[PDB]
Amino acid sequence: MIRFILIQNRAGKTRLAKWYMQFDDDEKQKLIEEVHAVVTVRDAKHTNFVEFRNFKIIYRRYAGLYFCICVDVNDNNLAYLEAIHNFVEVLNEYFHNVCELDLVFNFYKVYTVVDEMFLAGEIRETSQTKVLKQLLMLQSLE
Amino acid sequence: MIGGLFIYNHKGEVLISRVYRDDIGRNAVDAFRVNVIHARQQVRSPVTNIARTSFFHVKRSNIWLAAVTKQNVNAAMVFEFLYKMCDVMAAYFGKISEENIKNNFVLIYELLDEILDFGYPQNSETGALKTFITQQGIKSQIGWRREGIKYRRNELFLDVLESVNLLMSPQGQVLSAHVSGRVVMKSYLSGMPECKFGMNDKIVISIAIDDCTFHQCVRLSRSISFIPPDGEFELMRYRTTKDIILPFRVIPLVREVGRTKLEVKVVIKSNFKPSLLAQKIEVRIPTPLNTSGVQVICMKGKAKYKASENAIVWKIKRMAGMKESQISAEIELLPTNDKKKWARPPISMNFEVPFAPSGLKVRYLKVFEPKLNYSDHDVIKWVRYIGRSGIYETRC
Amino acid sequence: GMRGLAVFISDIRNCKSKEAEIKRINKELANIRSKFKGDKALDGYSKKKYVCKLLFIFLLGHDIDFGHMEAVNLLSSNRYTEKQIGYLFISVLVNSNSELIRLINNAIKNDLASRNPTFMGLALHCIANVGSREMAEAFAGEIPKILVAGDTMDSVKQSAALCLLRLYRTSPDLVPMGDWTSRVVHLLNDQHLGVVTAATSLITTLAQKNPEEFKTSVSLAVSRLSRIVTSASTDLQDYTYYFVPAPWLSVKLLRLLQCYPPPEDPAVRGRLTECLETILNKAQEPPKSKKVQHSNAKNAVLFEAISLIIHHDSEPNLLVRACNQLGQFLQHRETNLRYLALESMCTLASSEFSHEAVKTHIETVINALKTERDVSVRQRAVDLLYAMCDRSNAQQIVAEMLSYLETADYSIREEIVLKVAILAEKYAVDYTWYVDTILNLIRIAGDYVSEEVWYRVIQIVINRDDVQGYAAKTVFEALQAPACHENLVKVGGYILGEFGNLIAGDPRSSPLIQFNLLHSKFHLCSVPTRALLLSTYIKFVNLFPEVKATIQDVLRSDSQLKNADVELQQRAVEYLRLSTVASTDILATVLEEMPPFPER
Amino acid sequence: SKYFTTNKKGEIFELKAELNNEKKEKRKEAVKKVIAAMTVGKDVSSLFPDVVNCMQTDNLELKKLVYLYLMNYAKSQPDMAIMAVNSFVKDCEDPNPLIRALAVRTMGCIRVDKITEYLCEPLRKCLKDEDPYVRKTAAVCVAKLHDINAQMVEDQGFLDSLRDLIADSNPMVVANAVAALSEISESHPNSNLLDLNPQNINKLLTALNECTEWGQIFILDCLSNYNPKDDREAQSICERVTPRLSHANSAVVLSAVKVLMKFLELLPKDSDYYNMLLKKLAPPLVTLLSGEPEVQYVALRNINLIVQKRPEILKQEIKVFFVKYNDPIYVKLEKLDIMIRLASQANIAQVLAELKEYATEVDVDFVRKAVRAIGRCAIKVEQSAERCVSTLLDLIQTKVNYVVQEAIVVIRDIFRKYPNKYESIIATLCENLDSLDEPDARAAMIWIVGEYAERIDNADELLESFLEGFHDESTQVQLTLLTAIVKLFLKKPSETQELVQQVLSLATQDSDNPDLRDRGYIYWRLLSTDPVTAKEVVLSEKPLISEETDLIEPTLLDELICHIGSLASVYHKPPNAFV
């Protein structure tokens, strides 16, 4: 099951933090800092499957951003990596070639997209097209 | 002459760097972060020689300032340059802290370009650089002890009682590690003694966070100034998460010969000096539930199997430093259950070592009595480090 | 409109100092508190904007001590945006005021009672995200009824399934042994694939503790798997992902099948077997897209199917096919696939049926280890080599490990040395090979080998091995290098001192040459090494009279008689006195045969 | 990965839009934000052209900021910085010569083979300039050009101009010129190291009184390269360098001490200057230790060599080297070594007073070094060994484990140094038998029992106590126990016979140690053949031990004296060791 989801940058400033397991605020900050320290060291040639505490992290780079999902030691890694890419594609199509800043001015939209695609630490929906249709019909409603 | 100038925080990340000689690359930064800040086996020294690289490091509050060189340069001149640059930076933007450094990157680049001219430490006069530098920085703005206590012989015992917690991957990568400890000061003193207690800089003021909670009677200004209450009391409690010297290193190897056989070999290595001796070594190796029988062999200590706990218990009375021992167990498994292979819980071990796993060593401890002439020389001081094991588990 | 949030964020991100940012945050918090403290209540849009601002402030890491009253008041609003923002703010900030829990429970009950799918979906999302004990006690009996309701649409069914998942994970005792098992099991036949995904996740979680309850789902799942793999490229157009039909659903179905033993019905077993080799053959096909993403998506299903085959461990042909497919992945330009294939082959090496197939790939595993960059991949390859090593190919694997050691780095030498020592322990048949391998390992990386290893090699050399000449020759050829270090020096000193007479015929191994080598070693040796070398020296005094004279000048200098360490000085005194006083008869007497120890 | 890369809108697009703003204040703000983003790791390379478009501005703040930006790229990747040489070369008629200095040093930052053609003319035309800072930057740029291994035939004229820079009005200019010349002259080409000694030395010494502190460091370090030929010149140089006691904590003082020690070749019989120089070299080295811990460490490492070479300078200054509590550990250890080196016959009465006080401190390894220092003092002076033994027994009676262990370790060495002189002590040490667990202390106690065995009536019981747990002990302890038991058997035959079998037929065959097995078998054979030879081979008169620890190679010592002020003294290693 998914432990937490993070969208970070090279500067270390968190931009999205979804927590599916209970933690304290200082504990969350410590975990975010350690995740950033682990992710930023590795280069492109290195693997994307990094063990981290009693969990592991699946991460990918998109220009000026890092996407990381923390999963259990016994979950299929490539499935979650492709889920990361699918979430990125959904964001990109929904925000019309989303930039880094668009994850801040529309942070609640990012949260609702994550909740639509991810829930209870698992993958909810996988089809980009009708997820986008759901998001547009949601946006149309006032 | 002077290779490059680096400025780091307590965590070890490069706050701001500037190199002047092309022969120095990321290797110098990596070496300084690994073997200087995170040094464990070496006593701290201002100058460090690493693979033909000389490091001059100065600590101010919680900021490291490093000069990297590859030539034979005047050490005193380099240290004086570092001191003068620290003074100039303090003059421009007050206290030297992480927030202040991060607030004035432009001005720090300005200074490193002006005073440090390609390894040449030029003048660092505050009044001289005002014309030379244009940018300006941004500044940031009794009850617990009685009177008349008497003792025949003044004494005090310090016990640094630490517990190390670790979760290790089978390949040797340290997944999680921290140390939670306390200081017990059993002091039998007469009068109203003022105690100064100075330490090294290893402590900075479901998961662990680095923190340090003091007692009510202490005061801070490095140094701890207090008045010890009569009897036994806990000076402080703390929980560190970085730079933990590890008294033991466990390598498990499991081979599944088919389904009716298992071969588990566990090698324990001691990562401390040969003088120190670790006592009360207990290694708990998990065993599959459907265990028909076990053949367990060791060349050191004693070992046996417990079906009450379903585990191999390996007891070693004492272990020296920089030594390696192995346990080999051949387990015969009866496939009473069909499939659904047995999940292996981590291998655990308990130990006691006479040295703090956090690297803490007490530097100085004085008692000063303004009422009676006796001083720190007249009092008998005992120091005892005891580091036990908490959840010390390595995955197999 | 939504202009205050953008201006506030722009002002926050443009602050030059952290103190200025803190001042701005405090000013905004004070303004919001003053606005809400006023008696005159305003429209819901201002409250929505201020709640969103509070949420943004909390996201920056600051502490918020209020804001929940208007957060609850926003839930009762029929405008969707206000309800969504209020629910998000409640989910992010967990509150412990029992009156607030009562308010949110009442609001969620009202939302669920409503027939609007969006509002009930938001309520389910909030319950799943928060998942506290109070919410579980409130809605544990209510969620399954929503799950099995025939009038509820697909998205709400997915949300309710995942909410029940969360409740079961946080509150095991509040999910009863209900009668909704049949309906949730039969829900896997829904046309909407996302509902199938949610139900599959729920069944995978629930079947961990209740196997006998959800067994009937297994066969059904298999059917869906077939309908996922036999579909054409124009089928499941919504649920396609780079020319792959529903990868995630396939993976989850494979995990669900992994949660259960093989089915007893031969028909469903045959169907799932056909699906398995269908997946394997589809993987064997050339890629339909040159992009890495499609390959990753397909290989996800491939690896999960391989894991399912390993877990079942019933089809030798399937295991052989999986081993061959994994072996095709070692020479893959990508690194993630190589790491996953190495891990899966290490898992396979523990099965009797596929052991031969694992051993078939010994050469490609060695080549992958030799030409890899990442340390983790190398470690996994070495672990696989240790797992697959056996008496049939122990010599080849050990030789390749030593050959790698000749050019290896320090990040893997410890593990390689330890594994080589253990393999030499377990699979030694002839003494000559064992002695040669141990001596070569010493010469290469003695600084990491244990003390017991070179105690044991010397012991086995001493007792009975009739390879003393070869051992001495190997030691002498090792000792003539500048890269030697301490343990090699010790073992070489002992072996030479005991069997230097066997290689005295060779002019290149004259006693003077041996002494020159040992004296060159002395410059960089420790105290016990020096003591062992002095013992070897007196052995040579007894054995080689021709060199004996030049030994005395060695045992009279200030380095020996005036040594700071007591042990070396005492050894030097004893050996000088033995060499000088008496004659060669005493030294011959002190050098006996040392018969081998009894064997039990 | 085209995602999150589009430049139509985003942080990079906003920064680019702000960079093109007409108002200069917003342009400066944008440049500051760009520099901050680069520093924090964000890739802002796509903003490189636009900021280069900011070059042609009359404002100096923006020009300086873009200079720092370009220098920041200069050391990261030179290729990116190459694309700005066209704007760099505009360095002819621009006023405010600090701009010229910044430009020429920016060329100094970039290290490519393509920069030589475009830098030769500006460097040649900026060396001869009225502004002193341009001369400074030209002087350092000549050295940075000479850093690479190439001919650049204009380099001959470059060095000619650099040598001509010695006769300049501003002391800082000549200081930088001589520092650059020193950094260039580490390798000697065909035409260098000319014999222009007299006039250059006269000019350097005339300017030294007006140079900046770092300039004084450079000149005095360059003076260490010179070697004198006449004693009058050496005396004049020494008497002109002596007043160097400036505000510099150690740099000026240490470099001047280096120069004075190098220029020490005279006669004391008729010239009353050698003694006076040795007298006034003391106060500077004494006042060096009143600064900061790191500077104190460097000064202590230099004072170690100074004392080792000529001990008579610091003969009567043992008081200043007393360890303060607040100093760090390295300063404590170096001060301990200095105290040990200076332990003369007259100061011991207070030295053992201090070293006894240091053994009650709460620092474990420092107390260990203090008791080892007590032992070193005992070894150095034979007339004060009794006081050292009394102090060591006093420390022993304190009953602190980490003190007792190394105290008895030192007692072993003292007994070795002066055998049969402290017999009455040994019995007291017998009380501390069960309080030893460290291998060193246990080995020392076992050896102490082995020797002088006839003076202990219960030594058999002491050895039997350790023999029970023979295994699980270090190799040193096992070997020392074997040697002690064999020694005591010959001294005490027919009472400890049972020990011989228990140690040889049980503690040798069972042990897997090869060297220990050889020792056991040799001891068995010697004792079985004839005890007459065993007594004279085992109990031979052990000669004394040399105190070579507090001694260094005279040639190496001379080299370190030739390199007092630099890192060689701090490491105590030749410069050739670390090339």
Numbering used by the authors:
A (entry chain S): 1 to 142
B (entry chain M): 1 to 141, 159 to 222, 240 to 255, 261 to 435
C (entry chain A): 9 to 608
D (entry chain B): 4 to 582
How do the authors describe this structure?
We turned to cryo-EM (SPA) to try to resolve further details of the interaction. A chimera in which N1-N3 of the FCHO2 linker was fused to the C terminus of Cμ2 via a 30-residue linker (AP2:μ2FCHO2-N1+N2+N3) was suitable and was used for SPA structure determination. A His10 affinity tag placed at the C terminus of N3 allowed us to ensure that purified material contained full-length N1-N3 linker using a Ni–nitrilotriacetic acid (NTA) agarose recapture step. Compared to our previous analyses of AP2 by SPA EM under identical conditions, a much higher degree of particle heterogeneity was seen with AP2:μ2FCHO2-N1+N2+N3, likely indicating a decrease in stability of the closed conformation due to the presence of the FCHO linker. In the range of particles observed of AP2:μ2FCHO2-N1+N2+N3, there is a contraction of the gap between the solenoids of ~14 Å, yet without the movement of Cμ2 out of the AP2 bowl. A key residue known to latch β2 and Cu2 together in the phi pocket, β2Val365, is no longer occluded in the FCHO-enriched SPA reconstruction of AP2:μ2FCHO2-N1+N2+N3 when compared to AP2 alone, further supporting a destabilization of “closed” AP2 when FCHO2 is bound. Since the EM density following N1 in the AP2:μ2FCHO2-N1+N2+N3 chimera SPA is located adjacent to the highly positively charged region of Cμ2 that includes Lys341, Lys343, Lys345, and Lys354 (47) termed the BR4 PtdIns(4,5)P2-binding site, this density can be assigned as N2. No EM density for N3 was present in any of our reconstructions. In conclusion, significant conformational variability was present in the AP2:μ2FCHO2-N1+N2+N3 chimera as compared to apo AP2 (14), with conformations ranging from closed through part open to a fully open bowl connected to a randomly positioned Cμ2. We have been unable to visualize N1+N2+N3 simultaneously bound to closed AP2.
